[PDB]
PDB file of all heavy atoms in Angstrom:
ATOM      1  N   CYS A  35      37.449 135.301 -30.313  1.00  0.00           N
ATOM      2  CA  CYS A  35      38.586 136.201 -30.478  1.00  0.00           C
ATOM      3  C   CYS A  35      38.321 137.189 -31.635  1.00  0.00           C
ATOM      4  O   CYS A  35      37.238 137.191 -32.228  1.00  0.00           O
ATOM      5  CB  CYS A  35      39.866 135.347 -30.648  1.00  0.00           C
ATOM      6  SG  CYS A  35      40.020 134.651 -32.312  1.00  0.00           S
ATOM      7  N   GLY A  36      39.297 138.025 -31.990  1.00  0.00           N
ATOM      8  CA  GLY A  36      39.227 138.865 -33.196  1.00  0.00           C
ATOM      9  C   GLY A  36      40.570 139.018 -33.898  1.00  0.00           C
ATOM     10  O   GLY A  36      41.613 138.693 -33.333  1.00  0.00           O
ATOM     11  N   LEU A  37      40.561 139.524 -35.136  1.00  0.00           N
ATOM     12  CA  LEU A  37      41.760 139.553 -35.998  1.00  0.00           C
ATOM     13  C   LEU A  37      42.898 140.385 -35.379  1.00  0.00           C
ATOM     14  O   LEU A  37      44.059 139.982 -35.403  1.00  0.00           O
ATOM     15  CB  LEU A  37      41.394 140.050 -37.412  1.00  0.00           C
ATOM     16  CG  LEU A  37      40.310 139.249 -38.163  1.00  0.00           C
ATOM     17  CD1 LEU A  37      40.192 139.778 -39.591  1.00  0.00           C
ATOM     18  CD2 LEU A  37      40.591 137.748 -38.223  1.00  0.00           C
ATOM     19  N   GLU A  38      42.534 141.497 -34.738  1.00  0.00           N
ATOM     20  CA  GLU A  38      43.400 142.334 -33.887  1.00  0.00           C
ATOM     21  C   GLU A  38      42.781 142.429 -32.471  1.00  0.00           C
ATOM     22  O   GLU A  38      42.776 143.479 -31.832  1.00  0.00           O
ATOM     23  CB  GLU A  38      43.658 143.693 -34.566  1.00  0.00           C
ATOM     24  CG  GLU A  38      44.489 143.553 -35.848  1.00  0.00           C
ATOM     25  CD  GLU A  38      44.806 144.938 -36.445  1.00  0.00           C
ATOM     26  OE1 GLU A  38      45.829 145.555 -36.054  1.00  0.00           O
ATOM     27  OE2 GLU A  38      44.042 145.422 -37.317  1.00  0.00           O
ATOM     28  N   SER A  39      42.254 141.292 -31.994  1.00  0.00           N
ATOM     29  CA  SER A  39      41.415 141.122 -30.793  1.00  0.00           C
ATOM     30  C   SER A  39      39.971 141.639 -30.967  1.00  0.00           C
ATOM     31  O   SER A  39      39.591 142.090 -32.044  1.00  0.00           O
ATOM     32  CB  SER A  39      42.116 141.661 -29.544  1.00  0.00           C
ATOM     33  OG  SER A  39      41.604 140.960 -28.432  1.00  0.00           O
ATOM     34  N   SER A  40      39.143 141.482 -29.933  1.00  0.00           N
ATOM     35  CA  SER A  40      37.707 141.828 -29.874  1.00  0.00           C
ATOM     36  C   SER A  40      37.320 142.332 -28.471  1.00  0.00           C
ATOM     37  O   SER A  40      38.151 142.299 -27.557  1.00  0.00           O
ATOM     38  CB  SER A  40      36.862 140.608 -30.275  1.00  0.00           C
ATOM     39  OG  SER A  40      36.996 139.553 -29.334  1.00  0.00           O
ATOM     40  N   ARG A  41      36.072 142.793 -28.265  1.00  0.00           N
ATOM     41  CA  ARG A  41      35.601 143.254 -26.941  1.00  0.00           C
ATOM     42  C   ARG A  41      34.167 142.858 -26.591  1.00  0.00           C
ATOM     43  O   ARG A  41      33.339 142.603 -27.461  1.00  0.00           O
ATOM     44  CB  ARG A  41      35.780 144.782 -26.815  1.00  0.00           C
ATOM     45  CG  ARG A  41      34.930 145.604 -27.803  1.00  0.00           C
ATOM     46  CD  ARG A  41      34.825 147.056 -27.323  1.00  0.00           C
ATOM     47  NE  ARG A  41      34.377 147.943 -28.415  1.00  0.00           N
ATOM     48  CZ  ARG A  41      33.139 148.303 -28.714  1.00  0.00           C
ATOM     49  NH1 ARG A  41      32.097 147.987 -28.011  1.00  0.00           N
ATOM     50  NH2 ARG A  41      32.910 149.015 -29.766  1.00  0.00           N
ATOM     51  N   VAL A  42      33.882 142.859 -25.289  1.00  0.00           N
ATOM     52  CA  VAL A  42      32.521 142.748 -24.731  1.00  0.00           C
ATOM     53  C   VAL A  42      31.948 144.178 -24.658  1.00  0.00           C
ATOM     54  O   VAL A  42      32.696 145.159 -24.633  1.00  0.00           O
ATOM     55  CB  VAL A  42      32.524 142.031 -23.359  1.00  0.00           C
ATOM     56  CG1 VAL A  42      31.118 141.733 -22.826  1.00  0.00           C
ATOM     57  CG2 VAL A  42      33.260 140.684 -23.426  1.00  0.00           C
ATOM     58  N   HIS A  43      30.623 144.312 -24.655  1.00  0.00           N
ATOM     59  CA  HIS A  43      29.916 145.603 -24.697  1.00  0.00           C
ATOM     60  C   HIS A  43      28.763 145.643 -23.681  1.00  0.00           C
ATOM     61  O   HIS A  43      27.952 144.717 -23.708  1.00  0.00           O
ATOM     62  CB  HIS A  43      29.410 145.828 -26.133  1.00  0.00           C
ATOM     63  CG  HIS A  43      28.792 147.185 -26.321  1.00  0.00           C
ATOM     64  ND1 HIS A  43      29.459 148.391 -26.121  1.00  0.00           N
ATOM     65  CD2 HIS A  43      27.488 147.437 -26.631  1.00  0.00           C
ATOM     66  CE1 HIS A  43      28.548 149.355 -26.333  1.00  0.00           C
ATOM     67  NE2 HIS A  43      27.355 148.812 -26.639  1.00  0.00           N
ATOM     68  N   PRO A  44      28.607 146.682 -22.831  1.00  0.00           N
ATOM     69  CA  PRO A  44      27.573 146.717 -21.784  1.00  0.00           C
ATOM     70  C   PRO A  44      26.140 146.511 -22.289  1.00  0.00           C
ATOM     71  O   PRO A  44      25.382 145.743 -21.697  1.00  0.00           O
ATOM     72  CB  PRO A  44      27.739 148.073 -21.087  1.00  0.00           C
ATOM     73  CG  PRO A  44      29.230 148.349 -21.245  1.00  0.00           C
ATOM     74  CD  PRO A  44      29.521 147.807 -22.643  1.00  0.00           C
TER      75      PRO A  44
END
Side-chain angles (χ1 to χ4, degrees):
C35 78
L37 303 186
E38 293 184 87
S39 206
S40 66
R41 64 162 163 92
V42 187
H43 186 60

